[PDB]
Each structure stands twice: as structure tokens, then as C-alpha cells.
Design a protein around this ligand. Sequence first.
Ligand SMILES: Cc1cc2nc3c(=O)[nH]c(=O)nc-3n(C[C@H](O)[C@H](O)[C@H](O)COP(=O)(O)OP(=O)(O)OC[C@H]3O[C@@H](n4cnc5c(N)ncnc54)[C@H](O)[C@@H]3O)c2cc1C
Ligand SMILES: Cc1cc2nc3c(=O)[nH]c(=O)nc-3n(C[C@H](O)[C@H](O)[C@H](O)COP(=O)(O)OP(=O)(O)OC[C@H]3O[C@@H](n4cnc5c(N)ncnc54)[C@H](O)[C@@H]3O)c2cc1C
Ligand SMILES: Cc1ncc(Cn2c(C)c(CCOP(=O)(O)OP(=O)(O)O)sc2=O)c(N)n1
Ligand SMILES: Cc1ncc(Cn2c(C)c(CCOP(=O)(O)OP(=O)(O)O)sc2=O)c(N)n1
Ligand SMILES: Cc1ncc(Cn2c(C)c(CCOP(=O)(O)OP(=O)(O)O)sc2=O)c(N)n1
Ligand SMILES: COC(=O)c1csc(C)c1S(=O)(=O)NC(=O)n1nc(OC)n(C)c1=O
Ligand SMILES: COC(=O)c1csc(C)c1S(=O)(=O)NC(=O)n1nc(OC)n(C)c1=O
Ligand SMILES: [K+]
Ligand SMILES: [Mg+2]
Ligand SMILES: [Mg+2]
Ligand SMILES: [Mg+2]
Lengths: 582, 582, 287
Amino acid sequence: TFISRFAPDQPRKGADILVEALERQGVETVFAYPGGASMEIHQALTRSSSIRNVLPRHEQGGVFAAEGYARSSGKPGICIATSGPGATNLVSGLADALLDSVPLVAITGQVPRRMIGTDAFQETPIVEVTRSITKHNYLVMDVEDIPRIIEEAFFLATSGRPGPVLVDVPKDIQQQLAIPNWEQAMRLPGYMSRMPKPPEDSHLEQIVRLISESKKPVLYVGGGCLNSSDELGRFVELTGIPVASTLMGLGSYPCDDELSLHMLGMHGTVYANYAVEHSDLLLAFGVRFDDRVTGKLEAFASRAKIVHIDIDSAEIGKNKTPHVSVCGDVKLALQGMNKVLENRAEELKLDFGVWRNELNVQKQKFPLSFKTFGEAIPPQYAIKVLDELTDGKAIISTGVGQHQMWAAQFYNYKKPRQWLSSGGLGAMGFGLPAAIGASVANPDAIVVDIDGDGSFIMNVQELATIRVENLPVKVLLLNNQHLGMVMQWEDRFYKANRAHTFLGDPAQEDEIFPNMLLFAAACGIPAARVTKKADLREAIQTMLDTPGPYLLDVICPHQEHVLPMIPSGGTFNDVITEGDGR
Amino acid sequence: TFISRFAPDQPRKGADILVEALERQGVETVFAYPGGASMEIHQALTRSSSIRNVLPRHEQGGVFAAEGYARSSGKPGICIATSGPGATNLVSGLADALLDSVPLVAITGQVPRRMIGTDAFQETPIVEVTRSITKHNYLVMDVEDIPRIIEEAFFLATSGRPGPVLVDVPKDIQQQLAIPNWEQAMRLPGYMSRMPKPPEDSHLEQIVRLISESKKPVLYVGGGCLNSSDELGRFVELTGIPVASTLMGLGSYPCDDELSLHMLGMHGTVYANYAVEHSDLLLAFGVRFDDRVTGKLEAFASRAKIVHIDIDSAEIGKNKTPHVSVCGDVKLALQGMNKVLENRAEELKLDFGVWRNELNVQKQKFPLSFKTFGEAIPPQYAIKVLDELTDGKAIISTGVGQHQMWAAQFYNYKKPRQWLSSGGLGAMGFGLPAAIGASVANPDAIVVDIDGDGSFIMNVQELATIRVENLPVKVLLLNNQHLGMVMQWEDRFYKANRAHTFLGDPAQEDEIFPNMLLFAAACGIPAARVTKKADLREAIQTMLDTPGPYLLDVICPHQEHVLPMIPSGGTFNDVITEGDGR
Amino acid sequence: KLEAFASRAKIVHIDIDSAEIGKNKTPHVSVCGDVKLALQGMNKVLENRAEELKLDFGVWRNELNVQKQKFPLSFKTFGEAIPPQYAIKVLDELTDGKAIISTGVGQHQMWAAQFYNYKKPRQWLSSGGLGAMGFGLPAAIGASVANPDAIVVDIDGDGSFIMNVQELATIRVENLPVKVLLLNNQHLGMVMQWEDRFYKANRAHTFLGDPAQEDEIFPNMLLFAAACGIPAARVTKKADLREAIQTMLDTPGPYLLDVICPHQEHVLPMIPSGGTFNDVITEGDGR
Ligand SMILES: Cc1cc2nc3c(=O)[nH]c(=O)nc-3n(C[C@H](O)[C@H](O)[C@H](O)COP(=O)(O)OP(=O)(O)OC[C@H]3O[C@@H](n4cnc5c(N)ncnc54)[C@H](O)[C@@H]3O)c2cc1C
Ligand SMILES: Cc1cc2nc3c(=O)[nH]c(=O)nc-3n(C[C@H](O)[C@H](O)[C@H](O)COP(=O)(O)OP(=O)(O)OC[C@H]3O[C@@H](n4cnc5c(N)ncnc54)[C@H](O)[C@@H]3O)c2cc1C
Ligand SMILES: Cc1ncc(Cn2c(C)c(CCOP(=O)(O)OP(=O)(O)O)sc2=O)c(N)n1
Ligand SMILES: Cc1ncc(Cn2c(C)c(CCOP(=O)(O)OP(=O)(O)O)sc2=O)c(N)n1
Ligand SMILES: Cc1ncc(Cn2c(C)c(CCOP(=O)(O)OP(=O)(O)O)sc2=O)c(N)n1
Ligand SMILES: COC(=O)c1csc(C)c1S(=O)(=O)NC(=O)n1nc(OC)n(C)c1=O
Ligand SMILES: COC(=O)c1csc(C)c1S(=O)(=O)NC(=O)n1nc(OC)n(C)c1=O
Ligand SMILES: [K+]
Ligand SMILES: [Mg+2]
Ligand SMILES: [Mg+2]
Ligand SMILES: [Mg+2]
């Protein structure tokens, strides 16, 4: 039973109605940056004793924090911004959430209704701007629509394929007095009629049949499995089918496990891509056959009968055409298949040990590798040490680039929602704010932002947020003084011709620039720099053991290349295994 | 005669064609941040010896810099970004340029043509997203359309009412080899047929007639007059009509002049708003009757015959209905009227000395004012000292808020394009990057960013850009530890109830947080902090005399309110002249 | 050509749509509002200051009345053939200018506007901006329902009329006294006219009759009416025209009068599209 701060017959501002609507959705935390068109909402927030605001220093920091909050918890992330420049600053985060299917509700203040379309002060047609980069959006045109729309927004954001929903609220609506009706019915008849039914037995039996008839099966798991770790683990025990994961699905199956092929794709392991290449049965659970993974589609799993289970019908048959498909929750499909695989367990004689042996040979001949030069610090080694010292239980957010790939390759995530990273849009500056959101959602957890010097400085202002909110966010800054990923492509495809990839100061090219330590000191955040590999272990330990926020500046040689690499649009035969920029 | 780096019969990459197209437009400087979808363009830039790139640390920094470049020169500003997260990071700047009518060409890399619409890696439908916040945009679908589209984009951005134009270029187009045709004809038959003709004599004679029949005329000038300072000055000499300027029109008429009523509007001077209120003839040249200026439209210039000259027909009669109008270049209209006003100079007996005396009485009774408390530093006084020490010849960019209004009130701009400020959208974080663009465009000029601690930290990463590019950007940071403008509205309309407006650290509320000096030190930028009013003059002098970049942290009491103030939607009778938050 | 239009005039524009004020022609004085209210206000002033003002544009009116004598609306009469202009002029006389007139689109539409003197507004129903054929007959239906006691006449062309000929059924079933004055030139006249002046009279699918019997009137519109139980007749000689129209009016209920016209007629005068007043065509047809 919900308790309101207002009487059932007591008229209150629309802004107060909007906040209570959030309270009735179980919202405990918002990321809101005040402005003229949203002042009323911010006032209403202070009257709430159950909702806490985390003030960012930039709205992009706000929305990225909401994403980190969502990704690390499974709850919807909520961010609030003012009209105009506030709203437009959310855009990268909205697109980010849509591409990675992250549940998000974004609320923006708007100019009064009568002022709309007149090019008014701080006015932006944000609904028009964001229609193609949100799952859905709204323009509230009456105070009485607030309870319904808020309920619909949370429902749409969290159900089916999750995604961002934006609600635009005109200032006069916020100021209007009304008595809300919470027993309103949602107006989503089309969306609800197309909601996937629970998986039928006939479809599930067909899959189990294909498994018993295969000899080289491979699991291909992604973001859709983040809530099915238990079910998937049970499935693997009953089948013994090796698991390859996408960038978005890391941790769904334990990375330190024997049957883990780790990540597949452009920078996936040789043995993961091998498995898919030579498979005769491909179990695609919660994936979307993106080109980072497939490369040339005609060569991708060319020998396999393909099973695709997705909650979005639009994804089934989009790029790769499956032989067998199921449109529904992969969690329910796994449960159903587990029931059958156990009751008919000995009737079936599942044993892909010969196939697993073949893959384990590839794992020995072509494992993940890095080279150590003198006392210089290998970024791969740095991440591997972090894994050991945190016992693989840390929440890891990243920026985008080389360090991102290494963070995915050399850390073994035990559970889902430990790995927070921008995959589809691949937005730099994501790491630090996402870590903020994750730490708020998980106060007792070890939270580490593995960032690059390019990505880190993009939203460096959120260091202030971290200190003020007293969040124990650790920053593992891998500093190669470059935009590494772009620099790598220059080396392989443009004869190493540098085109604005150096981030330091050409007047003092051997000096580290900027001095990230002083960025931290500005925000009262303790920090240090390590350069010698011998001192690295103790330095990371110090970062972890020191209570509160910490910045560790890890200096790396920039000549390092992410390996292995399948060129864009290429095949497994085109995989690059050796070489750098020396 | 233009000289190409390629033979007329030599096939070259589309990216090389795009860069030469910029060269043929006279482009000398771009603000580009590299990414996968735009690597080809960046490669092509290095082969150019006439175009220089300024690498920002954030694309929003890039686009804001392009704006500052444009506003301070009258040339189009050019920014380049990669696909996806690069493109979306431009959005605030695009909206900003559209609302303030700033000439801008934005180029974004895009995924290959065949990949469009497939939710590909780093793909954003940026044309769809930005259609409502640009003057026009393009999606290049063939390499042979590049010369035409680039030419059209620059033409559209700089002609008529200036504005931002975005050109989206797919990666495969950049890589395709072709022989460009530069003699292509632009496909803009509609736009060109609606281009305003030069002002007719009959229209101009009607205005001059109204002037001779008036007794209380007032000039109402704005952004449209930025290229007519000479013509406008000549006009004033011949008429003796007092001048009121918008936030966007500052400097069109010299602020230190006797006939200057300074700024009108919400935070305009009492005597400027008085003049308009009691005028019988309102000469609206290059303005758009925004609500910051007019307040309640029915009360705005209720006794005046209104003359409106605008190059955009859609602006004439939008909010306020004029008696006489001219659709065309205000520069040409001024020239025509000057010719008549001089030939019929003694036939006309223009003498509004009685009206000017009435206004000068209001100027004595209600001048701009500030109070000095002990040794604390008045922000108004700080800006006034900067004016004296730079002799009013400095280029001034600002953030958004209280400091912005004070920068407009207490600095007397002699010429147009000294004043760079986000007016229509009012985007924070604009100041520092805009100063960067201005300094690149004007290497020998004194460039000063008058910023607030909220706005400054939003794009603080561009401090790195400043040092690396060795730009003599001065930062006058007015630090009140708050979001001042919002805090002011809290005091007057919400009983001073603080809702997330404090920017410091509540654990050490008397300590200045963050330490902006260390932000500068991180980027090797010399800096200092002043707290006592007695030391202020010497501190600013040091900032100016010190060669290169400099940050001056000016500590101000936060209780200050911007005055005077006409409440939103109010009239002249509702003007607030006294009070703060003490 | 906008640059030539009223090039010597100070322009006053009163419109209730602000988007229309300054769109094509830039006014010196404008009022955004109801023209009805503007007229009322100006009338009050023009009467109170009536003798203070000495308004007398008799010299200007004399100059125009000279042009009216030298260049009036005209048509030519060939033998016993029926001039469509004359047909409409006779309808005006016999209905005393009090009839509601709907039209199709084309030559007959222009003649209906030129040679009928409408006394009051909302007598004239015609598609102007879009200019949609097949408008006449259904519009007459709507007008007759709204104005049961009024004389309603659809002045239509054989191309426009047949486009929605099915509404003849509607007319009979609803027992509406809709009169149809069908001006039949066996062609798409307006298009045919442009062919004559701009394409050397090269016919491109403008003939509406049957090429196997090109002198026979096709289709037989009388039988269209008979199908829907609507009394009808056809007139060909100018001498019988007056009595035929009278019969149409005096006959209670719906009626179709098929008026046969020579197709060589051109709508005059004509200013070519995008032209000026100096480019006005005053003479010529397709003979
Ligand atoms: C520099 C860089 C390099 C990259 N290289 C790689 C790489 O080498 N390898 C790699 O894998 N990725 C790589 N990516 C990431 C890549 O772009 C995509 O983000 C990722 O591959 C797609 O993840 P996904 O296939 O698991 O589908 P997701 O984007 O995670 O979407 C989840 C899918 O499952 C469905 N789904 C959601 N919930 C359910 C449910 N309950 N039941 C059933 N279905 C559900 C959804 O409809 C959707 O189709 C890289 C990114 C960057 C920035
Ligand atoms: C916190 C804050 C407070 C503000 N308060 C105020 C205030 O108190 N007073 C104030 O004035 N502003 C204030 N503003 C700014 C305000 O929102 C607008 O930016 C500004 O008032 C509009 O400028 P403008 O009227 O000159 O037209 P502009 O936005 O500058 O546009 C120029 C106009 O002239 C036309 N034009 C352009 N070129 C030509 C040409 N060659 N010939 C003829 N016409 C041309 C254009 O079509 C356009 O209509 C404030 C902004 C902020 C952020
Ligand atoms: C906002 C933005 N701009 C540009 C890019 C393109 N981009 C860029 C410029 C990368 C290099 C990132 O540099 P870094 O220092 O943050 O990390 P690494 O040096 O490890 O690559 S990665 C990449 O794909 C992007 N993903 N996001
Ligand atoms: C990106 C963004 N967010 C929010 C606002 C709304 N806003 C805010 C939050 C202002 C206060 C700015 O604080 P400041 O420190 O930069 O300057 P002052 O303290 O002098 O006001 S001003 C204003 O209109 C805005 N204009 N732009
Ligand atoms: C539905 C439609 N199609 C085509 C046209 C173009 N059009 C055509 C084909 C006209 C000739 C109409 O023939 P008509 O018999 O109805 O009238 P006239 O012979 O008097 O011109 S008039 C004209 O502008 C149109 N206006 N409407
Ligand atoms: C924020 O912009 C708006 O909401 C706005 C656009 S038009 C219009 C009448 C309004 S408002 O309702 O009357 N609030 C307002 O002007 N302001 N102006 C401010 O600072 C100048 N603030 C803080 C407002 O709320
Ligand atoms: C940048 O994104 C794209 O341009 C892109 C989307 S789909 C597709 C086939 C391409 S690309 O032409 O083949 N370049 C590319 O993949 N990448 N990938 C990169 O890093 C992973 N870089 C730097 C690219 O250019
Ligand atoms: K930033
Ligand atoms: Mg780097
Ligand atoms: Mg401040
Ligand atoms: Mg005809």
C-alpha cells in the first residue's frame, strides 16, 4: 500500500504529481541538472523524502550515469534535464541506450505550451529531435495525462526489448493544480497485442532435437541473456556445449569456466571465432548478429544450422536467416529446454567431448597474448592484475577504444552486470559517469573505471560529482597519450600516417600531457602515477585499499595493438594475429 | 585562379574532393575530432597545406569553437565529426547556431551506404535527428554530388538569414575515386527566387516620413545589424535617434556613446525599457521581437508606430504587427535612408533633443548600479575594471547565467563581433570553446572568457586544446560557488528554497570547490586566485600582461542578484530595481 | 510577374492569416485580422470625418470607364451555333441573377465567372486553388440541400460532368431540384486552348468523343440522365436556346440541358502565365 504526501482530495502542482508518479514506480534515485523549465520539478524533488538526486556537472554525465545505474542493476535509469541546451545534452545518451537496449526514462522540462513553435527562449523540439533515437517519446499536453504517460514510459522502457523513453513536460503543466487519477488504463493496445507469448513446446522440442543430432554445437550469447545466468548455466551443465559471448553478453556465462570460449568477433579470441566457423549448430541466444561479430555474413557460420531466440521479431531474419527460431524471452526458453533436457537426460546421450577437444587444441595454440618490453607496463597485464586483486568481483565500466577491448579480453567476469560498456554506439566519455551510476546503485561494490586518456578527459568534470557524493569510484587510467584505436587503424591501413591522434603537447612531446593527477587534486581526489611494471601491483593495491575515490595514472607504450583482429567485413581466414606499431 | 594538388584528369578519393571543395570556399581552419567513419577525411586534411585543423577534446567543444570562430569574424565556422557519438555530440551547437543565426557548416562521417538503416556500428540517423535544428542538411549518396552539395551548404549557411548546415558523408563515398566537376550548378531554385530584393525607394521614403512626424523615436537594434555598424552610425548622426540594443546586437552601436541606451529587455536598463515604453516610433532593425525583450506583447511599445526591417519574411508580423515593414538587408536599407536623410537634411528639421532630455533624466535617476560589501569583490566591478584595462577593445565570450548578464551590462563594446554569447538557446559551457575559435580567427586580439564556475567546468577539457594550440586565451572566472541565475529565481519565486544549485562540497562548505587553479595547472596554464577587492586590479593586469593562456579565479559573494529585472511575461511597470538574497 | 504587379501602388493588405502577409508581395501597410471588423472600423471613421475628407476619385473612375468602353468582355456569334458565353448570359436574365451556380473546371468555368452577374456572395461555388474537375455536380447537390428553395444550376463541361456522373442517382433519389447546364464542346477545352496557343494546335488526347463517329455527339448525356429518371433535352441552334433554358427552369425537379457549342472558342482575354499586363491577348481562337 502506497502512502502519498498529499490527501486524495487535495489539489497539488503537476510537478508534485510527476514526482509521486516516480515514487509509485519505486524510483529511489534520479540524475537531474536544474534549469528554468524544470525548476518546479526540482522543487518537488526536495519535498520527496524517498527520491534522492545526484547532481552531475553536465547533462551528458547525467544520462550516462543513469545508464550505468541501469546496466549494473537491471532497474530503469532516470535522468532529468531542463529545456533546450539541457535536453540536447542528453542526446548521445539516448542514442546509446537505444542501440544497447538499456532501460531508461528521460524527463525534460519544456517551455509553456503556448510558447511552443515560436522559437522561444531555450526552446528545442526535443520530441522531433529524439524520435529516431528513443524507443518512444511523449509531449505532455495536459496535467491529467501525467500519471498515465509516466506509467506507460516505465512500462515501455523496461518491457520487451528494453530502451530509452523520453517525456517532455511543459512548464505550465508543472505549475497547474490537479487531483491525479492513478487508476488510469494505459493506452498501448498495439504494443501489448504484439508482446511475445511464452515459448511453445513444439518449438523447444525442435531445438533439443537439433542438439542431439549435432556434433559441433556452439553457444552464441549476448545482451539478451543478462537475466538468465542461472538458466544458461543449467543449460550448459545438461548439454556441455561451449559458450561464445558478445561484447554485450560478457559474464552471462562465467569467463573463468572451462567451457568458456570468451568473446567472439572482430577482436574475439581465435578459438571462439574458430568454433563458430566450423560449428554445425549455432545457438544464438539474445544476440543481434552485428557486423563486429559476423564480418562477411555469407561466411559466418556457413556450415551451421542456426537457432535464433530473440524477444524482438524484427531481429529474427534481419541479417542472418535462421533454420529454427523462437520469438520470446530467452529465460523462459532456457527453462523449458532444461526441463526436457533433464527428463530425457539419459535417453539422449549428449557428449561433445570430441568437439570440445578440438577447440581446446585451438585454445592452446592460439591463446590471448601480450608482450612485455623492459620495465614498460603492458595494459593487458595491468587489467590482469586488477582481476587478481579484486578476485574478479569488481564492477567495471570503460571508455571506448583499445583499453575497452583489453578490459573485455583480460578480465574474467563471473556474473552479468559487472561489465558496463558502450557497445553499439561506442561513445567515449562513458566510463566515468557510468561508474558513478553503478556505485550509487551498488554502494558496497568495488567499482572501477578502466578508461583511456582521450575518453576520460571528455567528461572529466564528473570528478566533482564523485567527491561531493563521496562515491568510492576507482579510476584505472590507461594512458598511452593517444587515441589508440584510431592510431591502430592508421598503422594497418594508412601507412602509420598520423592524423590528429596524438593527445599530448608537441612542445614537450616526452612529457605526459595533460597531468591527470592535478585534475583529481582539483576535486580533492587522491591519486598517483605508475610507470614501471615492477611497481604496478603495489600501486593498484593502494588504489583499492584507500577508502573512497582514487585515480591511478598507468603509463603505457602507445605502440600496442589490440589482437587478434578480423578486418571489417572480412572472414575468419583474414584474422591478424601478429604485429604492432614499432 | 585556384590551384589544385591534383591534375584535372587525375582520379582522387571523395575525401580529397571534399577537402578541395573547402579550399575553394576559402576555408583556412576546421575543428575536427577523428573517428572511424571520418578517418579518410582526416587523412585528406593532412595532405592539404592551406587548411589547418584544431583538435578539440570534445566534439561539443569543436562545434562551439566553430561558432566562436564565426561570431568573431563573420566567416562560416566549420566543424567535422565522425559518425554516431561524434555526430550526436554536435547537436547542442547546431541548435545554438540556428537560434542565434550563426553561419556554420558541419560535416559528419557516416557508415557505408549499404549499412544505413541496419543499426550498424556507430550509426546514427543524424539527418533525421538534426532536420529541425539546422537551416538545412544533406545526405551525400554519390561521390559526384560532393562539389555541388558543399557549395550549396556554404551558400545556404552564409546567405539570407545565416544558420547551420550539416552534410553527412558515407565512408564508402569518401573512399571512392572520381574526377570532380566544379562547374556544377546549384539546385536551389526555390530559395533563390525568394531571396529578398534590394529595398525599394517607396518603402524607404515612408520610413523617413514617419521619422519627421515623430517626437519620441527609438532605435531597436539586434543581431541583424552586426555588419552595418558604419551605416547605422551614419544613420544616428543624421537623425539623433537614441539606440537600444538586444543581447545579440551589442556593439553594433558604440556602448560608450551619448545616444546609447544600452541593452533593453528582461535585464535591460530602466531607461532603455522606458524609451520603448513611451516611444511613438519604434525602429526595429535586425531583431526578432523575442519575449526576453518584449515581455507582454500587448504592452510592448503600445504607443508606437512600428517599423520592422528583417531579411526573413517569416519574422515580419510573427509576434508584433508592424505598421511599416521592409523585407531585406538592413545594411542596404540604412544606405538608402542615409542618402535621403542627407539630401533632404535641412528640408527636414530633425531635433529630438526634448525626447533625449527626457531619457537622460531617466538615465540619471535609474542608472546601472551595484553595491560593495567590505573587501568582497563585486562581479560588476571586476568586469568594469577589465573594460578599463583592455580599453574596451577585447573580444569577450561568456557562459550563461548571472555572469553573462553582468558581462553584457558592465562592458562597453565599441564594435560588433566583440561580444560572443549564447542568447537564444543559452547553452552553458559555450564560453571557453568560443574563446578558442575567436582567438584562432583573431590571433592578435585580446580574447577573454568571462565564465561562471558552473558553465566553465562543463567543457573544462578544452583547457588542453588551449595549451597545445598555444592560444592567448584569458579566463576571467567569476566564482560564486553556485548556479547563480537559478539561485536568483529561487530567491524571488520559491522563497529561497535551494534545489541543487550549490556547486561546492557540503562537507567543506566554506572551502572553494573545485579548485579551478589545479584544472589549469593540469594543462600547464598559469593561474591565480583573487578574493579581496583591493587586489583585483593588479590581478587582472597580471592576467593580461602574462603572455599566453591565463586563468584568474575571481571569488564573488553568491548573494548578488542581476538587476534590474522584468519578470517573464511582465510589463515595464513590473520592473524590479532593488533587493538580493541577504 | 510579381515585380510588375501593382508596381506603382502603395499596398494595403488585410488578412486573418499572418503567414499570408508578405509571402509574395510586400505591403507598405498591413492589418492581421478579420476584414469584417476592419471594414466596420474604417466605415465609422469615414463617416465621422466624411466632409473633412473630400474623397472624389471621379477622374480615376472616368479613366477606367474609358477602358471599359474600349475593351469590354466580348464574344462572336457564328451562324446558328451557340456561343457558350451567350448561353450563360441568357441564364442570368432568366434567373434574374439570383441563382446558385456551381461549375466544373476549364473554359466553361471561366465563362461562368465572366458572363454571370452575381448579386450576393455564396452564389458562386467553384474550385479555384486546386481546380478539381468533377466538382460541379456534387457541389450543386450540397448547395441544394443547404438551400432547398433556391435555384441551383450546375454549369458543367462534358469532361468534368462525366467524372462524377454517378451522382445523378443521388439527385433523383434525394429529389433535389438541381439543374444541369451542360456546355458540350466534345473536348477538354482549356487544355485544347493551350495546345492552340503554345503547341501549334497539336492535339494530345483532348478529344472526348468517338473517333469512329467524330461528328456524332459522344457520349449521349441525355441517356445518362434517363438512366436516373432525370428529364433532359439537347439544344443546338442559338434560336432555340432561350426557350430550352426556360423549360429547364420551369420544369419542377432535376433537369439536364445539353448545350452544344463549337469547340474552337477561346477564353478571352488572356495574360500568359508569369506575364505582365502588356502581354495580354485580346483576339484569336482556333479556326
Ligand atoms: C571499439 C569496439 C569494438 C567492438 N568489437 C566487438 C567484438 O569484437 N565482438 C563483439 O561481440 N562485439 C564488439 N563490439 C560491440 C558491438 O558493436 C555490439 O555492441 C555487440 O556485438 C552487440 O551485442 P549483441 O549481439 O549481444 O546484441 P545486443 O546489442 O546486446 O542486444 C540484445 C539482443 O537480444 C535481444 N533480447 C533482449 N532481451 C532479450 C530476452 N529477454 N530474450 C530474448 N532476447 C532478448 C534484443 O532484442 C537484442 O536483439 C565492439 C564495440 C566497440 C565500441
Ligand atoms: C539568461 C539570458 C537572459 C537574456 N535576457 C535578455 C535581455 O534582457 N535582453 C535582450 O535583448 N536579450 C536577452 N536574452 C537573449 C534573447 O534570448 C535573444 O537571444 C535575443 O534577445 C534575440 O536577439 P535579436 O532580437 O537581436 O534577434 P537575433 O536572434 O539576433 O536574430 C537576428 C534577426 O535579424 C534578422 N536579420 C539577420 N540578418 C539581417 C540583415 N542583414 N538584415 C536584416 N535583418 C537581418 C534575422 O532574420 C533575425 O530575425 C537573454 C538570454 C539569456 C541566456
Ligand atoms: C565521442 C566519440 N568520438 C570519437 C569516437 C571514435 N573513436 C576514438 C577517437 C577512439 C580512441 C579513444 O581514445 P582513448 O584514449 O579514449 O582510448 P584508447 O587509447 O585505448 O584507444 S575509439 C573510437 O572508436 C568515439 N567512439 N566516440
Ligand atoms: C547546459 C545548460 N544547462 C542548464 C541551463 C540552465 N541555466 C543554469 C543552470 C544557469 C546557471 C549557470 O551557472 P554559472 O555558474 O555558470 O553562472 P552564474 O553563477 O553567473 O549564474 S543559467 C541557466 O539558464 C543552461 N542554460 N544550459
Ligand atoms: C481531375 C482533373 N484532371 C485534370 C485537370 C486539368 N484540366 C483539364 C483536363 C481541363 C479541361 C476540362 O474539360 P471540360 O470539358 O470539363 O471543360 P471545358 O471544355 O470548358 O474546358 S481544365 C484543367 O485545368 C483538372 N483541373 N482536374
Ligand atoms: C526557461 O525558459 C522558459 O521556461 C520560458 C520560455 S518562454 C517563457 C514565457 C518561459 S517562462 O515560463 O516564463 N520561464 C522563463 O522565462 N525563465 N527565464 C529564466 O532565466 C532567464 N528562468 C530561470 C526561467 O524560468
Ligand atoms: C566506424 O564505423 C564504420 O565506419 C562502419 C560501420 S559498419 C561498417 C562495415 C563500417 S567500416 O567502413 O568497415 N569501418 C569500421 O567498421 N571501423 N571500425 C573501427 O574500429 C572498430 N574503425 C576505426 C572503423 O573504421
Ligand atoms: K565535458
Ligand atoms: Mg589513449
Ligand atoms: Mg556560478
Ligand atoms: Mg468540354
